[PDB]
Amino acid sequence: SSFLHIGDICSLYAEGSTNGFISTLGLVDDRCVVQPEAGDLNNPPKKFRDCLFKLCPMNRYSAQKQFWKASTTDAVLLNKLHHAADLEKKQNETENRKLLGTVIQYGNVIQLLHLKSNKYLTVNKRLPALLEKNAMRVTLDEAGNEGSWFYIQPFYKLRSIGDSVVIGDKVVLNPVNAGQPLHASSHQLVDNGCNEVNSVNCNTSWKIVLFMKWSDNKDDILKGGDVVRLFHAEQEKFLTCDEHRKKQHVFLRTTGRQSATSATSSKALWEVEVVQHDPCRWNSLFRFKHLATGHYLAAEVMVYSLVSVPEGNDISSIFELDPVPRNSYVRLRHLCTNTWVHSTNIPIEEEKPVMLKIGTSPLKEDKEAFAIVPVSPAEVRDLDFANDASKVLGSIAGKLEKGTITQNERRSVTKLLEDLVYFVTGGTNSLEVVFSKPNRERQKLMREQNILKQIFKLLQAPFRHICRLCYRVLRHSQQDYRKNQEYIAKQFGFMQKQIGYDVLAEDTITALLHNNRKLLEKHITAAEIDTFVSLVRKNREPRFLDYLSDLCVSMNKSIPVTQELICKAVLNPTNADILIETKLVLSRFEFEGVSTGENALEAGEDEEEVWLFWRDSNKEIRSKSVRELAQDAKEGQKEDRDILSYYRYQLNLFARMCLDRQYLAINEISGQLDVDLILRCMSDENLPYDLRASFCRLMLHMHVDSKDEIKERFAQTMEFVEEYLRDVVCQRFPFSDKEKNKLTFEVVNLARNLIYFGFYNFSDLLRLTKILLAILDCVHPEKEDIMVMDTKLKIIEILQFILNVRLDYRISCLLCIFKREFDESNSQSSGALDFEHIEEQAEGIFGGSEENTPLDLDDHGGRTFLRVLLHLTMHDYPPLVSGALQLLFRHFSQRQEVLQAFKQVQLLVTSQDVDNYKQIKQDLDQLRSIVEKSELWVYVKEILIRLSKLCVQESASVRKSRKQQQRLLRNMGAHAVVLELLQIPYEKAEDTKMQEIMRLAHEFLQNFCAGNQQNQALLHKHINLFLNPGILEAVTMQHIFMNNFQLCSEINERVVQHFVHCIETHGRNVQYIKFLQTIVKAEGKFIKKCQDMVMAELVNSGEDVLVFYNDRASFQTLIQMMRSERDRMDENSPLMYHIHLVELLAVCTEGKNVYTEIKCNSLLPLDDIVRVVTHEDCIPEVKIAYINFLNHCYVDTEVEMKEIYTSNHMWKLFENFLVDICRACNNTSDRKHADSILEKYVTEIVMSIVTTFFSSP
């Protein structure tokens, strides 16, 4: 008849005194029960996916059971016992696939495996059970042990061991050694009508009810119960179910990612109900149970439309497929109705929604094609092992808001809020952790499955394992996850009281502090002078107060900050003593050196605490260099010191330079300096990884060959460094290298910059180099990538002093050494008064030392030195020009005082553009903040007129400065954000700005329509410009029409035609007949210039991507209607600026008849031009005699054309034997001396013109 097999999926139905279908209580609770009333044979359980199992051969638990004795100090013996538990664990997978399908046979030793929870049924021999007192504890263990082997055997003696098992047979399962047979209890659990199954010799009879037979070739085939998402072929959109307006709606969901297929949520997942007849396992129909709610899908009231139905029974919840295979791309058909599905664009209150309704149509299409994207089974068990969590905190957060919870529930919830930690980090944290790194897909599975929501509706009403243990879960799921962080605001202020009962809420606000930088710092504020004083007066160890200290990041933190320091001098009530002033401290040290406990222990705390925050002082040095008195560092330790001298140094000497030099020399060198400069540039610049820099490290170890007070610490250094060279003679950077290579670390780099701030141009700084050579040479997988982040930085401090020296300090003398003669008498080396401008420019560095509190020396003395700059702006670029930029950098803080500009204004006085603006993009991300703040207030004035000047500068330069804008970081953000504020504002003539800082960026090699390929995407997303009745603000029009030209004006795609046609389209021309003289006259006293620029804007449509403008059939869709309308604008005068609208309309007028061949059917356009070119006054023809001679040759080539365009063009043959005969210009201007090339290119352009005419039309 019909047999059971290894592979079949069935159900087992208990037939003793309590009946049922076994089932779990979720992926949280590892128990097993019989829901007697949850279903019967005749009426199957409604969740008959959690009462399903797979029949497994016998598994191997000896080397894995050996591996569950982690009785060993040894580490090589542990990695051994594992490689045997994992080889075993894969020998199981191997052997289990061959045996796939066998007639099982009675008295085989099978185990049983849960599909939905993917854990093995297992008898825990050495336990009692929970609801029953004798029976062993039957649990669901994920990987199994010997306690999951089950002897299957026939209950009745109808069949008997040694025949092959039939389907249905009642059987008893009997573990191989764990003792007694499985048995469905009589004992309702506590919480749930759920009888707890356990092991105890009993007369229960297990029927075996098949579900799928062992033919489900997957993920190979779509068979009933596979979880899939349903992607859209045309629309490129997944199929989802949610609620809008408190109503369940299905829809297609829109994504803003830049990779459609990277939009995965746990709500587009649909269970497949391969409809059968009884509840079991491409020509038959299908139903989609929405994988999240439990509501199927069904199309009800395009004749019909899709929405969720609570029960998937109604014939409506049945469909039919059209091209089975896993990952098929199908078209589907709603059965009851006979219609084929279709996606609209009317959505369901929001501003810019996302939910696009989906409906049906009796018309079968070809593009509405969906993709049966199969879901990974783990992800399905992820959504599983979270929903549980949502409903666990749904009982417990419900039972503790209105009253009390037992001692069994605390133990299981606390447990829960440890497991989730064990989830969200992709199995890394938990306890005594080593690492703690997040896993993204789970975090999204929390805000979307209201784990988070549950959490905040739990805290709100001992707790020592509830809060802030939640609050560390919250510290894991918002990690580097913006969208989930835009939630802790109202929550952030639990961190306070949750910071009490435990400093765990501390963890969060610093996970805050850093990223939530800038904007975290404004809400604490003086709050802090009451949460360290508190955190000091309650957190006796004061952890809170400390990692607070460790949280300070960004210049703007120093303020509010320094305030608490003062509380500290009123708060030094630590009830202990420290003094000597060299002895009893020192003695202190000989004593905590003792690794003894309690006392010695303590020292670590105030030691770190001093190092970090006391050095904390960076360039607030003054506050730092005033708070850090006596300079001591004999015993230096962990880097504390290196930091402190930073604190003091800032007070003294912002070092700067300029780059040593300039001119052709630096080259002759570097070239002389050959690759070298390159080999090391890659390793540090790149080779963040060890290996790559390692190679340039071989390329090294072959080679072959008045400071006074700032000095008196420097020497103790060089000795110590040699030390690093004497410890260096010691290869091992083992344990030592934690201490040494930290203290070091804090040394290595701060020394890079200490040689860039304290060398000397005599044989000393260098000869010290010499000794450093022998220093730097004295020093040259596994847990060493967590350590090798730190190694990576060390090699930076290395190659860092190394390059600040070796690159830019290095080689400075051989230079001035080589002075001799060259031609003019032996002259060996042993802009006018360059001095005066470099000692007003030193009046400058002294400028660079001063500050705003200095009201006396602030305004009166310095003044606008800018005049010197403005006056020497024409003269050649000094070398201490990067030392100029010294001054520049400082003003990046702020500018309220009107004063800035006049001084700031000297800088504008510049005449070595290219080279600088290379150094000026230094601020590109800041100065992008200068256009985004300068832009939220423009369209104190020095930051928008200065971020614009900076812009026309990185705008009137190289084609490479153009590509360098490289403004994915951030164009689309300076056009979308400068617009955003800057569209709705527009400034009237004459002073008005939106047009020069969005009009010096698109200087695309000073015409024509090219190299602006970036201008289809940033011009892609934007808000448009006004239209129809009314009017708007002036200038930023003139600006706009032009600006559009250069964004969608490139010549290369077919867009450009629909682009200078999408929007204004043909329709624009109409409104350009009358009324913009009116918006320019309400626009500004000079009405007719914003109008006349409105006229170079409407006449230049042919000029930019004309060629392209035509693109596809652009001269066929407005043929006829633009030429006649043009006669409507055929007359004008007094046009110097509008005659740049008559050379931007003689370029505009040149782009009417350069491309046509069977489209022209109008008359008379030819006399009118001739008339307009004769009616001229003002400027020497030569530009209107190369635009009208340029007209006279572009006309004179055609020939038989015009000979259809009008009756004759005979006034046009005298007129080009004039704009071409001319005079010395036309009388006596005599301004051109490349005549022979004039007459030449004009007589090989009169020879190219001669070849043409023969082919006229």
Ligand SMILES: O=P(O)(O)O[C@@H]1[C@H](O)[C@H](O)[C@@H](OP(=O)(O)O)[C@H](OP(=O)(O)O)[C@H]1O
């Ligand atoms: O840019 P960020 O800061 O990474 O933030 C993502 C961005 O807003 C995506 O557009 C969004 O996808 P949708 O547009 O499809 O929502 C995604 O949501 P998700 O994390 O929920 O996928 C966000 O995390």
